[PDB]
Amino acid sequence: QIGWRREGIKYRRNELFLDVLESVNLLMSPQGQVLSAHVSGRVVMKSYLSGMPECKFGMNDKIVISIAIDDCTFHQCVRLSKFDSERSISFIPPDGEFELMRYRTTKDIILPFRVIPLVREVGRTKLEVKVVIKSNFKPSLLAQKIEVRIPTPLNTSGVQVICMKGKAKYKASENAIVWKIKRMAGMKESQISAEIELLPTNDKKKWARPPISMNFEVPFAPSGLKVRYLKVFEPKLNYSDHDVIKWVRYIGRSGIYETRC
């Protein structure tokens, strides 16, 4: 009697995979003040379970109105739990892959990187740029696919750049220095230096600097959300989550991650 799951599903091997997928968003001042930050998250499940399994998902945070999650929406299969009703939900899942819930958090976010900019005018013909990035997570974890984008003014005539890790180039048509790093461990720093030559191009006003933007991926959930339990029970087939191959992953990525310069 379940609209989203047929009867008779059978798998040789019962498996349940869960990905906590998060985008961390930040606006930060040149001096490191958090002006705004939030996480937008979703939980994607891949269910290869026989029969009509009854599943219970509990987290460390209150996800049903231990920080609270500002807002949360749930797949149609999700029901409120009679017990631990603020941190957990219950459901018979659809078969295969589906999105179990989406959410937003704003408090106690782990900011994986700090960008520290230095953009000093030298006369009217030159900008000296140094940007330091600091990774703020466990040293045994690696961020990957890191990109830093540093804007240049429209009167830019030339750029010289040297990065200490990864690779960088000036994309003149985009007025940006693009700095890419394949991997970086936690509690590290790296930096890039550039000299930007400017045309006189007087008769204009001051340069309204876009922020420095970052992209990255991190192997954790910046919200701090943690799965406390993932229960499965099928009384007719008589198996439970300890007969199921389970896998819980936490995957973080930048959303809009911007630092004023």
Numbering used by the authors: 158 to 222, 240 to 435
Lines from the paper:
Proper operation of the pivotal CME cargo adaptor AP2 requires membrane-localized Fer/Cip4 homology domain-only proteins (FCHO). The AP2 complex, composed of α, β2, μ2, and σ2 subunits, is pivotal to mammalian CCV formation, and its deletion is embryonically lethal in mice. FCHO1 and FCHO2 are similar in overall domain arrangement —folded N-terminal acidic phospholipid-binding homodimerization F-BAR domains and C-terminal folded μ-homology domains (μHD) separated by a ~300-residue, low-complexity intrinsically disordered protein linker, which has been suggested to participate in AP2 activation, although how it does so is undetermined. We dissect the network of interactions between the FCHO interdomain linker and AP2, which concentrates, orients, tethers, and partially destabilizes closed AP2 at the plasma membrane.
To confirm the identity of the extra, Cμ2-proximal electron density as the N terminus of FCHO2 linker, chimeras of Cμ2 alone with N1+N2 attached to the C terminus via 30-residue unstructured synthetic glycine-, serine-, and alanine-rich flexible linkers were then created, crystallized, and their structures solved at resolutions varying from 2.0 to 2.6 Å by MR using an unliganded version of Cμ2 as a search model. Crystals of a complex of Cμ2 and a peptide corresponding to this WxxL signal were grown, diffracted to 1.7-Å resolution, and were solved by MR using 1.9-Å unliganded Cμ2 as a search model.
